[PDB]
Symmetry: C2
Subunit: 139 residues, 2 copies
């Protein structure tokens, strides 16, 4: 339910862009990846296959709506999606806009750094646009 | 449709465990990660959101079946799920069984190694057990 020592039970995880009963979407303020968002399950569950099929589905619909919003607002070269949870075993999806000359490309963002990069952190305008784009698709 | 220079248009990608029209499930032979499976879309498509919602849904069903089968056969500490495609932009999902004693834990498998880990490659019984577990769920 709620583990008092799990950061995703105890913290928002970033600026909340959208939420419902099942989950929340946040902009993670990552200096190397503006527009990096996470879909975080509200309750503490370890694996996607711990969820009932209907919950799995609802969660994945939010993830794909967030992919679409990030594509539209950020216009990235590639989208990466991942649910890892090795350090924090509480279901959460990274939705990451990648660019050919970003810090790590074509490595994953968890891999070796490839180049210097200096992407402009999101402005209120972009953050707003992300919120609108997610809302359009989910509300 | 078919990109002649794309590894996932021109190779099985591993030993095939299950397939239908839309996709195939393979066991990736990775000496550090027995039970690493991949769900590869059969045609060339760059992003998940480039798929029709009926196709996204079905692919994700296959992914979640493979997750459940890997958990049953491998009894991992954690599952990692990921669609990256930075090096090969053809939709495919990594379904990775992780263990506390694996090479990278709690890093992602793309990160720095933390320990020695020389695991036993899967026997015919385990690979066959994966095929059966996947098939029972999808057929
Ligand atoms: Cl993670
Ligand atoms: Cl990849
Ligand atoms: Zn938690
Ligand atoms: Zn291809």
């Amino acid at each position: 339910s709620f583990h008092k020592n799990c950061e995703l039970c105890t913290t928002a995880g970033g600026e909340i862009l959208w939420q419902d009963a099942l989950c929340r979407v946040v902009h993670v303020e990552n200096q190397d990846y503006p527009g990096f968002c996470r879909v975080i399950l509200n309750r503490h569950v370890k694996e996607m296959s711990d969820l009932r099929p209907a919950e799995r589905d609802h969660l994945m619909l939010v993830v794909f709506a967030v992919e679409e919003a990030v594509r539209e607002v950020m216009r990235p070269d590639k989208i990466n999606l991942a649910s890892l949870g090795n350090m924090t075993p509480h279901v959460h999806w990274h939705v990451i806009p990648r660019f050919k000359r970003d810090r790590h490309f074509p490595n994953s963002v968890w891999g070796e750094t490839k180049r210097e990069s200096l992407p402009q952190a999101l402005d209120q305008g972009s953050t707003t646009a992300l919120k609108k784009a997610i809302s359009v698709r989910l509300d």
